[PDB]
Amino acid sequence: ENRIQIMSTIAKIYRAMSRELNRRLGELNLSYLDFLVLRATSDGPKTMAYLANRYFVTQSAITASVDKLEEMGLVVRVRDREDRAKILIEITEKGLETFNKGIEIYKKLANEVTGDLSEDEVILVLDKISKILKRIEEISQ
Amino acid sequence: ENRIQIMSTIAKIYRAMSRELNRRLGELNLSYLDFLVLRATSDGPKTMAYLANRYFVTQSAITASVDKLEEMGLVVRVRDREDRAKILIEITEKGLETFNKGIEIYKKLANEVTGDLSEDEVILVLDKISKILKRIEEISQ
Numbered sequence: 631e632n633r634i635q636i637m638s639t640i641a642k643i644y645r646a647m648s649r650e651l652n653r654r655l656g657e658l659n660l661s662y663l664d665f666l667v668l669r670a671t672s673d674g675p676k677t678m679a680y681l682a683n684r685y686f687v688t689q690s691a692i693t694a695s696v697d698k699l700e701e702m703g704l705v706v707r708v709r710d711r712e713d714r715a716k717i718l719i720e721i722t723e724k725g726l727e728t729f730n731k732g733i734e735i736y737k738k739l740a741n742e743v744t745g746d747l748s749e750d751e752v753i754l755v756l757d758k759i760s761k762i763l764k765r766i767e768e769i770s771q
Numbered sequence: 772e773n774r775i776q777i778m779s780t781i782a783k784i785y786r787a788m789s790r791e792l793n794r795r796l797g798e799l800n801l802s803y804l805d806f807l808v809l810r811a812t813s814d815g816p817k818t819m820a821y822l823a824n825r826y827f828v829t830q831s832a833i834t835a836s837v838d839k840l841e842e843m844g845l846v847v848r849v850r851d852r853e854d855r856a857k858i859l860i861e862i863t864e865k866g867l868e869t870f871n872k873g874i875e876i877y878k879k880l881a882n883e884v885t886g887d888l889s890e891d892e893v894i895l896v897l898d899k900i901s902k903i904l905k906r907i908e909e910i911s912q
C-alpha cells in the first residue's frame with residue numbers, strides 16, 4: 631500500500647543517491663562515508679563510537695575512513711591531556727575546505743534530483759518526512 | 772537549504788529503517804538484504820547480476836545472501852537446459868511464505884513510522900518523491 635511504498639521509495643532513492651554521490655565525491659578523493667565523517671566533524675569533534683552509530687556503519691569501517699582522512703590531512707585524532715585513551719576526531723582546515731567542496735557537490739545533485747518539484751512541493755515533503763525520521767529514530771534506538 | 776535537507780533526511784530515514792528492519796527480520800532468520808532478495812524473486816526469477824545492481828551491493832554480498840537462502844530452502848538456482856552456466860535465482864514455496872511474513876513486518880513498521888501522517892499526507896509525499904526517484908535513477912545509471 632501507500633505507506634509501504636513511501637518507505638520502499640525512500641530506500642530506492644537512497645541507494646541511487648549513494649551510487650551517484652560516491653561517483654561525484656570520487657573526484658574529491660572521497661567515498662560517501664568519508665564525506666559523512668567530514669560532515670559530522672565539520673561542526674565539532676566527534677568520538678569514533680558516535681560516527682559508527684549515527685551513520686549506521688561498523689567500527690572497522692569508521693576506523694578505515696578515519697585512517698584515510700588522517701593520511702589525507704583532513705582530520706586529526708585529538709587526545710585528552712590527562713588520558714590520551716579518550717579520542718575525538720577533529721576536522722582540519724584542509725578538511726573543512728574539502729567538506730565545503732563536497733557539500734557543493736551534494737547541493738548540485740540535490741537540485742537536479744528534486745528538479746521536478748517546485749519550492750512549495752519541496753517544503754511539503756520535507757516537513758512531512760521529518761516526522762517519519764523522528765519516529766523511526768525513536769523506534770530503532 | 773530545503774532540497775539538501777530533503778535528501779539528507781531521506782538518508783537518515785533509510786539508515787534508521789535499515790537498522791530496525793534488520794532487527795525485526797532477524798526473527799525470521801533474515802537480514803534486510805536477504806529479505807530484498809526474496810522480494811526481488813517473489814515476482815519472478817532474477818539473475819545474480821540484476822540483484823547486485825538493483826540493490827546496490829557487491830556481487831560477493833549477493834552470493835553470500837543467495838547461498839544462505841538456498842541452504843534455508845528459500846530459493847534455488849535454476850539452470851538452462853542447454854547451458855547450465857546461465858543461472859537464475861528462483862524463489863521456493865517456503866521462500867514465498869517467508870517473504871510474505873517479511874512483507875507483513877515491513878507493513879507494520881511502515882504504518883508505525885508514518886503514523887503522524889494522514890492518508891492524504893502520505894499521498895502527497897509518495898507522488899512527489901516518486902519523481903525524485905525517477906530522476907536519480909536516470910542520473911546514476
Ligand SMILES: [Ca+2]
Binds near residue numbers: 767768769770771
Ligand atoms: Ca526508543
Ligand SMILES: [Ca+2]
Binds near residue numbers: 908909910911912
Ligand atoms: Ca542515464
